[PDB]
Design an enzyme around this catalytic site. Structure first.
Site, PDB file in Angstrom:
ATOM      1  N   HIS A 174      35.320 -59.906  44.287  1.00 13.72           N
ATOM      2  CA  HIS A 174      34.318 -58.738  44.028  1.00 13.72           C
ATOM      3  C   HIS A 174      33.545 -58.524  42.776  1.00 13.72           C
ATOM      4  O   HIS A 174      32.625 -58.098  42.618  1.00 13.72           O
ATOM      5  CB  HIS A 174      34.967 -57.601  44.757  1.00 13.72           C
ATOM      6  CG  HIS A 174      35.002 -57.439  46.452  1.00 13.72           C
ATOM      7  ND1 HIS A 174      34.208 -57.991  47.221  1.00 13.72           N
ATOM      8  CD2 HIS A 174      36.319 -57.303  47.147  1.00 13.72           C
ATOM      9  CE1 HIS A 174      34.444 -58.182  48.580  1.00 13.72           C
ATOM     10  NE2 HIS A 174      35.997 -57.624  48.443  1.00 13.72           N
TER      11      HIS A 174
ATOM     12  N   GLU B  89      29.713 -59.167  41.756  1.00 17.56           N
ATOM     13  CA  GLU B  89      28.906 -57.943  40.980  1.00 17.56           C
ATOM     14  C   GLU B  89      28.246 -58.316  39.662  1.00 17.56           C
ATOM     15  O   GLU B  89      27.165 -57.967  39.575  1.00 17.56           O
ATOM     16  CB  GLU B  89      29.708 -56.719  40.782  1.00 17.56           C
ATOM     17  CG  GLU B  89      29.004 -55.587  40.646  1.00 17.56           C
ATOM     18  CD  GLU B  89      28.389 -55.087  41.889  1.00 17.56           C
ATOM     19  OE1 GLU B  89      27.201 -54.339  41.834  1.00 17.56           O
ATOM     20  OE2 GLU B  89      28.799 -55.568  43.040  1.00 17.56           O
TER      21      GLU B  89
ATOM     22  N   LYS C  33      25.637 -61.034  40.206  1.00 13.94           N
ATOM     23  CA  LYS C  33      24.323 -60.301  40.861  1.00 13.94           C
ATOM     24  C   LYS C  33      23.557 -59.658  39.809  1.00 13.94           C
ATOM     25  O   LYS C  33      22.400 -59.673  39.578  1.00 13.94           O
ATOM     26  CB  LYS C  33      24.936 -59.567  41.960  1.00 13.94           C
ATOM     27  CG  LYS C  33      23.977 -58.258  42.267  1.00 13.94           C
ATOM     28  CD  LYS C  33      24.590 -57.172  42.937  1.00 13.94           C
ATOM     29  CE  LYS C  33      24.532 -55.748  42.391  1.00 13.94           C
ATOM     30  NZ  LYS C  33      25.103 -55.034  43.232  1.00 13.94           N
ATOM     31  N   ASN C  34      24.428 -58.966  38.990  1.00 17.60           N
ATOM     32  CA  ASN C  34      23.578 -58.100  37.786  1.00 17.60           C
ATOM     33  C   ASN C  34      22.988 -59.101  36.913  1.00 17.60           C
ATOM     34  O   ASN C  34      21.718 -59.029  36.539  1.00 17.60           O
ATOM     35  CB  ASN C  34      24.607 -57.451  37.170  1.00 17.60           C
ATOM     36  CG  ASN C  34      25.101 -56.100  37.907  1.00 17.60           C
ATOM     37  OD1 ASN C  34      24.641 -55.863  38.989  1.00 17.60           O
ATOM     38  ND2 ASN C  34      26.317 -55.419  37.324  1.00 17.60           N
TER      39      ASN C  34
HETATM   40  C1  LIG Z   1      23.209 -51.828  38.024  1.00 15.34           C
HETATM   41  C2  LIG Z   1      22.672 -53.311  38.829  1.00 15.34           C
HETATM   42  C3  LIG Z   1      23.062 -53.009  40.200  1.00 15.34           C
HETATM   43  N1  LIG Z   1      22.353 -54.131  40.951  1.00 15.34           N
HETATM   44  C4  LIG Z   1      21.389 -54.755  40.262  1.00 15.34           C
HETATM   45 CL1  LIG Z   1      20.856 -56.199  41.219  1.00 15.34          CL
HETATM   46  N2  LIG Z   1      21.303 -54.830  38.917  1.00 15.34           N
HETATM   47  C5  LIG Z   1      21.772 -53.976  38.210  1.00 15.34           C
HETATM   48  C6  LIG Z   1      21.321 -54.103  37.010  1.00 15.34           C
HETATM   49  C7  LIG Z   1      21.482 -55.417  36.178  1.00 15.34           C
HETATM   50  C8  LIG Z   1      21.225 -55.694  34.879  1.00 15.34           C
HETATM   51  C9  LIG Z   1      20.843 -54.535  34.078  1.00 15.34           C
HETATM   52  N3  LIG Z   1      20.654 -54.684  32.750  1.00 15.34           N
HETATM   53  C10 LIG Z   1      19.544 -54.188  31.931  1.00 15.34           C
HETATM   54  C11 LIG Z   1      18.188 -54.808  32.871  1.00 15.34           C
HETATM   55  C12 LIG Z   1      17.474 -53.926  33.630  1.00 15.34           C
HETATM   56  C13 LIG Z   1      16.486 -54.803  34.133  1.00 15.34           C
HETATM   57  C14 LIG Z   1      16.077 -56.068  33.977  1.00 15.34           C
HETATM   58  C15 LIG Z   1      14.901 -56.661  34.614  1.00 15.34           C
HETATM   59  N4  LIG Z   1      13.608 -56.134  33.962  1.00 15.34           N
HETATM   60  C16 LIG Z   1      13.253 -56.807  32.750  1.00 15.34           C
HETATM   61  O1  LIG Z   1      13.703 -57.306  32.087  1.00 15.34           O
HETATM   62  C17 LIG Z   1      11.543 -56.757  32.826  1.00 15.34           C
HETATM   63  F1  LIG Z   1      11.319 -55.460  33.112  1.00 15.34           F
HETATM   64  F2  LIG Z   1      11.279 -56.708  31.486  1.00 15.34           F
HETATM   65  C18 LIG Z   1      16.865 -56.579  32.780  1.00 15.34           C
HETATM   66  C19 LIG Z   1      18.135 -56.225  32.382  1.00 15.34           C
HETATM   67  C20 LIG Z   1      21.691 -55.469  31.987  1.00 15.34           C
HETATM   68  O2  LIG Z   1      21.440 -55.918  30.929  1.00 15.34           O
HETATM   69  C21 LIG Z   1      22.922 -55.997  32.485  1.00 15.34           C
HETATM   70  C22 LIG Z   1      23.863 -54.626  32.821  1.00 15.34           C
HETATM   71  C23 LIG Z   1      25.148 -55.226  33.553  1.00 15.34           C
HETATM   72  C24 LIG Z   1      25.406 -56.560  33.732  1.00 15.34           C
HETATM   73  O3  LIG Z   1      26.527 -56.833  34.493  1.00 15.34           O
HETATM   74  C25 LIG Z   1      24.637 -57.667  33.433  1.00 15.34           C
HETATM   75  C26 LIG Z   1      23.470 -57.128  32.600  1.00 15.34           C
HETATM   76  O4  LIG Z   1      22.325 -58.166  32.415  1.00 15.34           O
HETATM   77  C27 LIG Z   1      21.057 -52.960  34.542  1.00 15.34           C
HETATM   78  C28 LIG Z   1      21.060 -52.934  36.017  1.00 15.34           C
END
Ligand SMILES: Cc1cnc(Cl)nc1-c1ccc(N(Cc2ccc(CNC(=O)C(F)F)cc2)C(=O)c2ccc(O)cc2O)cc1
Ligand SMILES: Cc1cnc(Cl)nc1-c1ccc(N(Cc2ccc(CNC(=O)C(F)F)cc2)C(=O)c2ccc(O)cc2O)cc1
Ligand SMILES: Cc1cnc(Cl)nc1-c1ccc(N(Cc2ccc(CNC(=O)C(F)F)cc2)C(=O)c2ccc(O)cc2O)cc1
Ligand SMILES: Cc1cnc(Cl)nc1-c1ccc(N(Cc2ccc(CNC(=O)C(F)F)cc2)C(=O)c2ccc(O)cc2O)cc1
Ligand SMILES: [K+]
Ligand SMILES: [K+]
Lengths: 373, 373
Positions: free
Chosen positions: B225, B229, B232-233
């Site tokens: 899990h 997660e 996916k992020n």
């Molecule tokens: C919290 C969360 C939940 N579910 C999903 Cl699918 N995504 C998110 C999420 C993912 C990445 C982020 N960001 C910030 C972020 C937000 C949007 C984007 C996409 N948008 C752009 O880059 C564009 F708008 F320029 C990229 C990065 C990170 O840098 C990050 C955070 C946690 C992690 O484990 C890995 C990560 O890379 C923030 C929220």
């Protein structure tokens, strides 16, 4: 007497400034009278607030000769500043004398940090770490050293602006040049002790403006002290972890300028430290050792240089930045400096003496809402 | 009545177990009578302690249909377990009936986490985030979900040991295989939504025993899990940050087994997030969105899958691990799972209801000893 003066000014809260204000208030028509009207109140306030907490220290630390010396310097500086409280801002002689006093205090307080650190050494030499009050010592030292950084900032700005780059602030601090300066000085000391040193691999990304030099409004010496500390740590780790092999992996530094953050990430392959043990590195009692003796030709260990990790993190946090460590035990460690990219977000982080501060010295902070194991 | 039963068992503290104890207590001569004598007290204690905190929720959250349903499940399970408190451990029928009840409760509580999450959605749909009580909701949900994880662990162990791998614990959990499983499932969903996905670059270091497979005592689904997660992020970030270019950098995972820590570090080039905004990602009110509607053929956004970052970090912290994020705004993000390498260090982290917990719901936690700006 002196207790009455400290009590009067400790009632007030320190007034945090932003880097943008420091910059603006000392460029066009930098006004010595205006600085006088501010500092003749602000310096006694900042001195008095922290002097109240010196008085709360464990008696065995408070009574060390080094702490007594620091306290007497603060008392004397407070009294000398208070001589001006009833002078007129239009009295040119009073303004000139006040600037002379600031310059004098700046020199007198020049070794406050090493002298307080020696008090901590004296304390844990002669009595050990009393575990009941050791939370108090940690709490105090974070606040005393941050207070000192903030007072030094005001003394430097006024002395540099009016004792005759905006003061000590560079509006166009060249980040990579400071980093290389830190690397070269650390490498010099590493070579002297280990007869070798890791190479530097440096990468930069100006996301704000790609390909352009990375510059921010900052105090260059603050950045230097932080990056020097991190280089020294990564060099000690690398040289000792790979001593048997005789081949030393480089230290990688990645510099990024984002919309909000300037980030400096330093990565080493020094074998790392388990998560359970990393927070000790920010503990003053754990991280203070007697300084190397003068009477030797042998190279000084790297641990004998720099401000140390706790104070380095305070420098980052002073302007709303941070300094964080994350390690992969068995592999190596990442150290990251965070700095606000915008001068308007860079606001002094200042401790204030009040009932909450006092309660911190007289409470025990035990997370009883979770099971102990 | 029910208030009296909850009050009686909430006086006690939950008893944390180590992974080594879970393992040992269910291998040779795994004793159903012994588990009965323990669980007929321990399960009512753990249920009652968290039920006291459900009652402290803001009325507008407590009264949502989903929270009322979760509470009624806990009340019913508490009463059914309490039917056994006066039976004899040598009564074979009582032992058989107790195991049947545990199995029944395990199925009834199967969707506690999604149902509580839907209560949070109902809450912020119909009233918004009351800022005065929002600290309380965050505090409660960390503790409710951790409590639920701990109760699920006990229900699973007893059901798997006696309903007829040690229970749900694998004494030789193959870490890299779980990681690849998480990657493949995340990649499948990434392909469906973005029509492309980042490759995986995987590196491992067994510092404890170089070249040997990396295995620990662990519950594989917990690790799955967490890594799902994080994949996916990192996939969402990579695919959206580089959408214009059409070339997608890989996700790098570095696995290290040290003397004390198993570490899984996941690095992406998704452009990062400023330090000021990173902690919102662990906030339940901020990170809960209405789930995707059933009635569509369109691919489900990645945000619609998984337990979410806060609960994932709770899984890590449940056995004294952790899950930490550090980002370089403009460049990308590192996410790190920390797991105890030794089963004897892996002790349940359990919330306890007492005066300190209650005070948390009725105090404001304002760091007044530092200046506000
Ligand atoms: C919290 C969360 C939940 N579910 C999903 Cl699918 N995504 C998110 C999420 C993912 C990445 C982020 N960001 C910030 C972020 C937000 C949007 C984007 C996409 N948008 C752009 O880059 C564009 F708008 F320029 C990229 C990065 C990170 O840098 C990050 C955070 C946690 C992690 O484990 C890995 C990560 O890379 C923030 C929220
Ligand atoms: C001019 C100068 C030079 N060198 C140094 Cl070290 N300080 C100063 C200086 C800084 C601030 C002030 N303050 C004090 C001050 C204190 C706090 C702030 C903002 N922060 C807060 O309010 C804090 F309480 F949150 C702004 C200004 C003023 O009120 C002021 C500023 C500009 C000006 O043209 C005339 C002035 O009288 C005065 C002088
Ligand atoms: C705190 C400190 C102060 N002064 C000096 Cl010279 N070094 C240290 C110090 C440096 C590295 C560490 N360790 C742990 C550590 C400790 C000893 C060693 C050397 N010994 C061996 O590897 C050998 F014993 F196997 C290596 C790594 C890290 O992983 C680390 C911490 C902070 C940082 O910025 C960078 C880092 O790499 C710990 C303390
Ligand atoms: C055997 C079994 C199977 N399945 C499950 Cl879910 N639980 C058990 C089980 C676990 C613990 C116990 N406890 C309860 C218990 C509670 C806490 C601990 C350690 N932790 C603490 O003390 C905590 F309070 F800090 C150890 C044991 C015992 O006292 C016990 C253990 C082994 C044994 O051979 C005979 C026993 O009676 C009993 C049964
Ligand atoms: K004050
Ligand atoms: K209790």
């Amino acid at each position: 007497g002196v207790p009455g003066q400290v009590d009067f000014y400790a009632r007030f809260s320190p007034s945090p400034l932003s880097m943008k204000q420091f910059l603006d208030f000392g460029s066009v028509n930098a006004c010595e009278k205006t600085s006088f009207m501010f500092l003749r109140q602000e310096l006694p306030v900042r001195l008095a607030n922290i002097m109240k907490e010196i008085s709360l220290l464990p008696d065995n630390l408070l009574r060390t000769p080094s702490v007594q010396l620091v306290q007497s310097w603060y008392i004397q500086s407070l009294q000398e500043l208070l001589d001006f409280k009833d002078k007129s801002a239009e009295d040119a002689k009073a303004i000139y004398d006040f600037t002379d006093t600031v310059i004098r205090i700046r020199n007198r307080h020049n070794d406050v940090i090493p002298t307080m650190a020696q008090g901590v050494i004296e304390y844990k030499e002669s009595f050990g770490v009393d575990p009941v009050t050791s939370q108090n010592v940690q709490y105090f030292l974070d606040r005393f050293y941050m207070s000192r950084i903030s007072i030094r900032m005001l003394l430097n700005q006024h002395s540099l602006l009016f004792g005759g780059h905006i003061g000590s602030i560079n509006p166009n601090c060249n980040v990579l040049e400071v980093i290389k300066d830190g690397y070269e000085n650390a490498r010099r000391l590493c070579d002297l002790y280990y007869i070798n040193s890791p190479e530097l691999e440096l990468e930069e990304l100006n996301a704000k403006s790609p390909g352009q030099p990375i510059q921010v409004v900052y105090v260059p010496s603050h950045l230097y002290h932080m990056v020097f500390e991190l280089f020294k740590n990564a060099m000690r780790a690398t040289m000792e972890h790979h001593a048997n092999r005789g081949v030393y992996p480089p230290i990688q530094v990645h510099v990024t300028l984002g919309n909000e953050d300037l980030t400096v990430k330093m990565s080493d392959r020094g074998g790392g430290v388990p998560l359970r043990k990393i927070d000790r590195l920010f503990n003053y009692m754990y991280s203070t050792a007697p300084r190397p003796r003068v009477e030797t030709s042998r190279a000084v260990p790297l641990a004998g240089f720099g401000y140390g990790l706790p104070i380095s993190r305070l420098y980052a946090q002073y302007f709303q930045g941070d300094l964080k460590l994350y390690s992969l035990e068995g592999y190596g460690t990442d150290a990251v400096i965070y700095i606000k990219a915008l001068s308007t977000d860079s606001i002094e982080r200042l401790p204030v003496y009040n009932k909450a501060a006092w309660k911190h010295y007289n409470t025990n902070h035990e997370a009883d809402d979770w099971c102990v194991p």
